C-alpha cells in the first residue's frame, strides 16, 4: 500500500497531471484500472508476437514474479501429511523399478517439515511479491521516464 | 565519464551483460548508453551519489574499489 501510493502519486506528478490521482484514487477501481492496468501496457509488450525490446527482461521477470508467488501458495495451502504419503509411494516405486533399483539414496526422502513449509511458502511468496512489483515499478517508470 | 559531462542525457550503466542465450534482437535492444555492447542501466543512484561527492574519472572509481577491497581483506 505505501509503495503503490508513492509511485502512483509520483508518476502522475511526473506526467504533469496530479488530477489523475486526485480523482481516480478515492475508489478502488481507480487503483486497479488507472494505476495497475494503465501502467502495465509497455511492460507486458517488452516481448510480443511482433518482437521484443529492452523491456523484455522486466516482462519476463514480471511473470517470473507471478510464478514464484503462486508456487508459494502450494507450500502454504497444502500441508505435510498429504505429501508424506505421496512420497512413500515413490519410495516403493523406486525400490521396485529395475535398473533404477541399482541406485540407492543415502538420505531417506521425507516431506518437508510443517514449519519448513511455512518458511518455504513465505519465501516464495515474498520473493515473487518483490520481483513482480520491482519489474512493474522499473518498467513502468523507465518505459516513459515518468 | 560521459555521465558526469552530461548527467541529464545519459542513462547510467550498471555493468555489461554477456549472455550466450541472447538472440540478435536482444543484443541490439540492450545496447544502450554510450556502450559498445548489451548493458544494464543502473537504478541504484550510485552515479549521482559518486558524482555529487566528487568522483569524476574511471580512475577515481578504480582506486576507490581497490581501497574497499583492502578493507574487505
Amino acid at each position: 500500500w505505501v509503495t503503490f501510493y508513492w509511485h502512483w502519486k509520483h508518476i502522475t506528478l511526473w506526467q504533469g497531471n496530479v488530477s489523475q490521482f486526485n480523482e481516480s484514487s478515492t475508489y478502488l477501481m481507480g487503483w486497479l484500472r488507472d494505476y495497475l492496468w494503465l501502467n502495465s501496457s509497455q511492460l507486458i509488450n517488452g516481448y510480443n508476437p511482433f518482437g521484443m525490446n529492452s523491456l523484455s527482461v522486466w516482462a519476463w521477470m514480471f511473470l517470473f514474479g507471478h510464478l514464484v508467488w503462486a508456487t508459494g501458495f502450494m507450500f502454504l495451502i497444502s500441508w505435510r501429511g498429504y505429501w508424506q504419503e505421496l512420497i512413500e509411494t515413490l519410495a516403493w516405486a523406486h525400490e521396485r523399478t529395475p535398473l533404477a533399483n541399482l541406485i540407492r539414496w543415502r538420505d531417506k526422502p521425507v516431506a518437508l517439515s510443517i514449519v519448513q513449509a511455512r518458511l518455504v511458502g513465505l519465501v516464495h511468496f515474498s520473493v515473487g511479491y518483490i520481483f513482480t512489483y520491482a519489474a512493474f515499478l522499473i518498467a513502468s517508470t523507465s518505459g516513459k521516464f515518468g | 565519464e560521459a555521465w558526469v559531462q552530461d548527467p541529464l542525457h545519459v542513462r547510467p550503466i550498471a555493468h555489461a551483460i554477456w549472455d550466450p542465450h541472447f538472440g540478435q534482437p536482444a543484443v541490439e535492444a540492450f545496447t544502450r548508453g554510450g556502450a559498445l555492447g548489451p548493458v544494464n542501466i543502473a537504478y541504484s543512484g550510485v552515479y549521482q551519489w559518486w558524482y555529487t561527492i566528487g568522483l569524476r574519472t574511471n580512475e577515481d572509481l578504480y582506486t576507490g574499489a581497490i581501497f574497499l577491497l583492502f578493507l574487505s581483506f
Binding site: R106, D107 | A16, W18, D19, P20, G37
Partner: peptide
C-alpha cells in the same frame, strides 16, 4: 568480451558444479 567469455562460464557453470560436487561429498560423509 575477452574476459566475460571467460568468467561468465566459470562462475555460472564450473564453480557451481565444483561447489555442488564439493558440498555433496561433505554432506554425505560419515
Amino acid at each position: 568480451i575477452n574476459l566475460p567469455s571467460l568468467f561468465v562460464p566459470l562462475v555460472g557453470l564450473l564453480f557451481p558444479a565444483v561447489a555442488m560436487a564439493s558440498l555433496f561429498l561433505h554432506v554425505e560423509k560419515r
